[PDB]
Design a protein around this ligand. Structure first.
Ligand code: FES
Ligand code: FES
Ligand code: FES
Ligand code: FE
Lengths: 129, 400, 154, 376, 154, 154, 374
């Protein structure tokens, strides 16, 4: 599924990611923009044998189990396939565990490079919130 | 210390140990089930064609019963004469001959050893010694009798004829019900948490049955009843009947909506044959029961539900509705499964005490009315006869 | 379409009704002119029609429960139904034929737990006022043996 | 060939056959359970009003226990004097009289046959002979005794009074706990995979219990049969052990036993009773009755509910009590001809200041051999 | 709305945790101020409050498992949970009350398999950081009898 | 994506196939190059590879059933599978690993009903030409003990 | 008496022998704790110091354990205090054993090394002066190891395993256990029959031949045998695709040692069985499936495929679980009758045929000898 910007904002708010561990809704929307382009099926093989899954591009060596990745830690205790659904529940719950690990949202490369300290709140403007 | 001590020559007192003593149970196997009795095996209509067989039990002892090409029925012990394996492993089937799966010994439908795998060695090496003869080895064959389609077997050649064993009164009461071709309409088994004897006493307990039937007509025509007992004591009939042509709750009354099909007023007829056969007619509900012992405190009750082959759709439907009266969930017979157990458990600390059976006096013969235990005392007259438990020598000397 | 989830939900409510001894609610799961039977695989394979329980109207179910309350004597016990997933054989938006595996534990008041029956419900479902009802349920038991007696229906 | 051969007169040696011989078990039924003992039946508070009854066991033998209008408690064997069926089929209830369901014989609350269905026939046909007399047939009645809310039953005319049977030291130790009305707050049953004797030994095993600034002791009555084990002055939720003062001594633990199967326990604010029944040579049943006092506040009751985690089938303290019996049952499988060794605290079968002793265990066997005619 | 599928999934994860001897994860299924109790239908029918296990905090659950590891002695065995469909009594988007049938097999290291307990979980669910947690679970057992002892919670 | 609903449906059909003695349809559930094994928790924990049943092709499954029909002599009996919810352990866009709890009752023709096995299916699923198939199923049994023999696969 | 032997011959076995519970208790004191060697485990299953397992010699539970000296010891699993099992685990590794009931300590030989509170607490209670640790202890077993097979006896008087086995069976064991072996699986079968029925069945060449060139050997005692053998379509014939690894032609060798050890080689399928009695009409069969430590991947795969022939679901051995029960049930009315065992004559020695029951009669020669039933 390709989300609309505001659709995804509304779904992230209704899952309580607004100000979650410091981070306003716009950070989460901006992160998904530059991680996956709002595509729940986004999939990126790394040369390290790991893959990044779903709308928040969650890594298969640390966070979810894809059955293909040597040294899986599977710290969200989920198969990676649950991060490829039309429904963002499992992706958000794993995110909440990732952002709580305490490197904050720096965990999301594309969020550092393209979102950190920008006007974040822009990704939420013009949305029924 | 013998907990099998009979009080006197009368059956008004039963030692509770009779339901507990394991040595006494093994005697029941040798002296009753493999003694001068007829064991109910199956209906002839359940093995109609040549080769059709069933497996069942006479007491502890497994049995094959089979139709041959001659249209006669045979039965033999289900024990290979080699090292003792069951021969037939199936509840039922059709076969030309039986074969032990262990070492492929062949038996004909009479139970004769017809074949021994490698009898004559392999390349003149091993096999049976020259002294060995097939015809000297075989399972025990049973004398078979078929009476109104009921197939019975005895291990004794000397057992009286089924007609003499039953007596004329019971012969007629069976013919009354099995007067036409019957059709099996279902089978169910109950595992009873009680010694076999407790269930068979209960079949014969007219006191219990009248108590319950009397309770059942607090709900919804004057009836008289009676209890017949053969000369041996072992067989009974409990009946109830209207006088055809006298004057004078349920959301679906159809359960009791019956139809007339015997030339008499008999609404209920429960017939028993020592040591474990029951034939019943309750309105239009016809059935056979086979009672087997399993363990000192367990027994098996096998129901064969019956229709008549000539039943119309509507007549058969009536028997299917009335089946709700009988079997494991019967409006009438439900409690019959549990009361045996209530006794088994009530006597746990009373192995040395005696049951009291005085209803209708000392007698072991027929009676008008059902507030009696004559058919129960009859069971024990027959039992003690077969078990050699009449007054002994020493105790007879002292009394006389 | 009537589906596996709707039948599963129906089956769990049926089970809770029987297991909670709310037996007066048990006939409400059936149509007015339903069929209910408890039998076994041997009878079912040979085409034999008789049941431990046999009913061709909801009223007969109601009478069986009257008799359980007001007539039958039996030692106290309860059932615990454990059910499998339904399989639908055929069906449209309003009829469906389905099979559901079952296990029933019996727990005596004295505390003995035993596998009392297992098998499958061969069901015919219909829809009345938008709700699922049994036109037919045949409890086909795996065992020819019932321990002691059967008081409560499966 | 006899595996129930005692080594000496001393009780430092128990033949392992005692836990296996089936003939010996049937003697235990005749000589102990239906002999000169008091069998624990129930609490008086479980049958408060007239007609309130329970069913239970005295050894193998099922029992009815019931309150009558006179406010007294009666008990009789749960066996119909007709053909032997259980009379009362329910764990508990209230009734005017008892009736055997098989042939509708009626019994009053004393266990007297008051009624025989169709005694006089039906339409002058059958019924009982003229010579039959209701008052000559009946279940064996039990003598009942009460002590501070505990109901006991005996089959023996000759059994001493409950006060004499218990003795004064055990009488005082019971009254200490049961000095007020108690209220049942839960029941649980454990099926033990061991001969009853192994669990009762274990209740009395101060040696075992001490393995799981306080001084303790062990009291034994004159017969040997009854004991008291006593004790007196990391967790994320220490509230488990947050107690309150309610005994006018310092005693934090009192475990009391009465031959052949009664236990009363006080562990801080955790009060309970146990009934031990034999079931088969290698199985027994333990019935727990958890207790509050009727006058308990909400907060006091909460404490007993938290402290209950110490006791019962999953008890921090009592969990292992279920299994050790079985460990013995299985360890001795090839040793029916050998003897248990019980020498801790000497030959003594009386009270001791230590708890590193087996005096209360040897006491059990002194009392056992007395009842069983096994002394020498 | 919290639904039957979400509770069923929660129940299967609870079951796997207990059945896999990952007992340290078992308290994480409960709120800080939760209630957990193992009782039976006799106690529940009277209103008797005692449990084989009785806990009114997650910390009490944690201590019970510490004691299982550090203190309690018992013969090796595992549980196999077979669960029914949850039936929801009341609930909004965040709370729910529900009953779930259960059966627990006990398998000894020596290989014997027995029905060890059966009954229903009377549950109160809440939602913490968008996940289901038990505010309350009462394992109401069908039998008054526990075989040998109870080491692992139900 | 392979999901919990698809595996549930697959598991119910697998169960029905084995429990109905339609054993010829049993290999149809597997890929050509599949692995099937019946083992226990002890062997699985110590890394031991052997099975009561061990197959690395669909053809070996087909041979096991030929031999059951044509060759093997055993006393008649039937299975009753009660399954739990499948729980997906791993997956990508096309493959999935899952665990499904199971209990198998054995019912003899003579009527005895016993818990014959329990454990979990450790499964590898794929989806080929629109059909969900087992690449792998390991029936990891909770007990080291099989009563009498194992004729039919789990 | 249903255990009355007809004559001295063993062509007739009283069916009561499978039923009499008094006779079973005699089997415990005269066979399992008499002049026999009971199979315990493989030495490779307890490789390192402290490595132990628990099992049985008849009814009697046993601990078997490796010590620092690299020797193996075995003792009765019974605390010398009040009789509790000492070791509660199938297997593990320990410095010493401790009874959980009252914390008595035992070394790996089964000696009592420690008694909780032996000397009282604050000079109160404890053991009398007369009590001496070294006078109390479980029965220790004589241990023997032969090609890795660990056996235990209760009897000082029992001969060595080489003398007990005899030379023919010593060589037949060495044949297959000639190298280091590796356990590849364990499975247990609960048999609904008296132990003797399954052990007879292992020795039954008559049965096995039904299910080209072969023979049956019997030791001098009668108790041990070897059965040996040599040379619709399968969609996957790989099940029988073997490889050569014995220096003879022998494709089947089944070896038994009184009263409950079996070693088998069927093509590339190697396994050991332990037969234990459990109740008059039940026994336990423990399978230990084996590879050789030096197996390649492809050779191991062959053993994993050929394992389908053996154990609880074996194409060959499935029936072996049930036939005992078939006899137990067939004789339910015949406690007073006799089995007929005349195939190959009265003989209890080796034979070139397999249409014989000589190894079965051998079992009963050995049985009656141990039981004083000649
Ligand atoms: S036992 Fe029947 S052929 Fe050998
Ligand atoms: S047995 Fe009680 S009234 Fe007959
Ligand atoms: S029985 Fe072993 S220490 Fe007491
Ligand atoms: Fe064989």
């Amino acid at each position: 599924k390709v989300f609309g910007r505001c659709e995804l904002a509304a779904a992230m708010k209704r899952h309580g990611l607004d100000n979650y561990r410091g981070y306003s809704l716009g950070n989460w929307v901006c992160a998904a923009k530059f991680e996956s382009n709002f595509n729940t099926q986004a999939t990126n093989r790394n040369t390290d044998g790991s893959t990044d899954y779903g709308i928040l591009q969650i890594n298969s060596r640390w966070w979810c189990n894809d059955g293909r990745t040597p040294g899986s830690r599977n710290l969200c205790n989920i198969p990676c396939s649950a991060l490829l659904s039309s429904d963002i529940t499992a992706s958000v719950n794993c995110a909440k565990k990732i952002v709580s690990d305490g490197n904050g949202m720096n965990a999301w490369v594309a969020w550092r490079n393209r979102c950190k300290g920008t006007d974040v709140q822009a990704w939420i403007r013009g949305c029924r919130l | 210390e013998s907990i099998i001590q009979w009080h006197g020559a009368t059956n008004t007192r039963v030692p509770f140990g009779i339901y507990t003593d394991t040595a006494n149970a093994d005697q029941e196997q040798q002296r009753i089930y493999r003694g001068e009795v007829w064991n109910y095996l199956c209906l002839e209509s359940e093995i109609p064609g040549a080769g059709d067989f069933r497996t069942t039990f006479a007491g502890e002892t497994p049995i094959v019963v089979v139709r041959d090409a001659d249209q006669e029925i045979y039965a033999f012990e289900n024990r290979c004469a080699h090292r003792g394996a069951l021969i037939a492993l199936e509840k039922s089937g059709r076969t030309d001959s039986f074969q032990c799966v262990y070492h492929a010994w062949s038996y004909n439908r009479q139970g004769d050893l017809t074949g021994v795998a490698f009898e004559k060695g392999v390349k003149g090496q091993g096999g049976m010694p020259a002294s060995f003869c097939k015809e000297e080895h075989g399972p025990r064959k049973l004398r078979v009798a078929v009476f109104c389609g009921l197939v019975f077997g005895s291990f004794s050649e000397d057992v009286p004829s089924i007609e003499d064993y039953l007596g004329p009164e019971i012969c007629e009461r069976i013919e009354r019900v099995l007067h036409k071709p019957v059709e099996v309409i279902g089978r169910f088994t109950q595992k009873l948490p009680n010694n076999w004897k407790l269930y068979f006493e209960n079949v014969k307990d007219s006191y219990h049955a009248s108590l319950l039937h009397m309770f059942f007509t607090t709900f919804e025509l004057s009836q008289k009843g009676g209890v017949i007992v053969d000369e041996s004591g072992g067989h009974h009939v409990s009946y109830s009947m209207i006088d055809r042509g006298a004057k004078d709750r349920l959301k679906d009354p159809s359960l009791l909506e019956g139809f007339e099909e015997f030339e008499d007023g008999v609404t209920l007829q429960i017939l028993s044959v020592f040591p474990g056969f029951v034939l019943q007619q309750i309105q239009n509900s016809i059935a056979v029961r086979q009672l087997l012992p399993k363990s000192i405190s367990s027994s098996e009750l096998n129901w064969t539900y019956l229709g008549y082959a000539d039943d119309s759709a509507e007549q058969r439907k009536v028997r299917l509705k009335q089946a709700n009266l009988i079997g494991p969930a019967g409006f009438i017979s439900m409690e019959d499964g549990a009361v045996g157990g209530f006794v088994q458990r009530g006597i746990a600390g009373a192995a040395n005490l005696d049951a009291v059976i005085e209803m209708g006096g000392d007698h072991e013969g027929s009676s008008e009315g059902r507030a009696t235990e004559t058919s129960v005392r009859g069971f024990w007259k027959a039992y003690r006869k077969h078990m050699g438990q009449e007054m002994q020598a020493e105790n007879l000397y002292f009394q006389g | 379409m009537i589906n596996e989830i709707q039948i599963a939900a129906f089956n769990a409510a049926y089970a809770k009704t029987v297991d909670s001894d709310a037996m007066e609610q048990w006939p409400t799961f059936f149509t007015k002119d339903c069929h209910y039977r408890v039998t076994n695989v041997d009878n079912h394979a040979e085409g034999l029609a008789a049941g431990i329980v046999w009913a061709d109207s909801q009223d007969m179910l109601t009478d069986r429960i009257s008799a359980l309350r007001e007539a039958n004597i039996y030692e106290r016990h309860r059932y615990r139904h454990i059910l499998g997933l339904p399989s639908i054989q055929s069906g449209d938006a309003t009829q469906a034929s389905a099979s559901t595996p079952f296990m029933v534990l019996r727990i005596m008041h004295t505390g003995e737990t035993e596998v009392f029956a297992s098998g499958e419900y061969l069901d015919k479902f219909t829809t009345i006022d938008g709700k699922l009802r049994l036109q037919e349920r045949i409890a086909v038991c795996d065992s020819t043996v019932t321990d002691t007696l059967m008081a409560l229906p499966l």
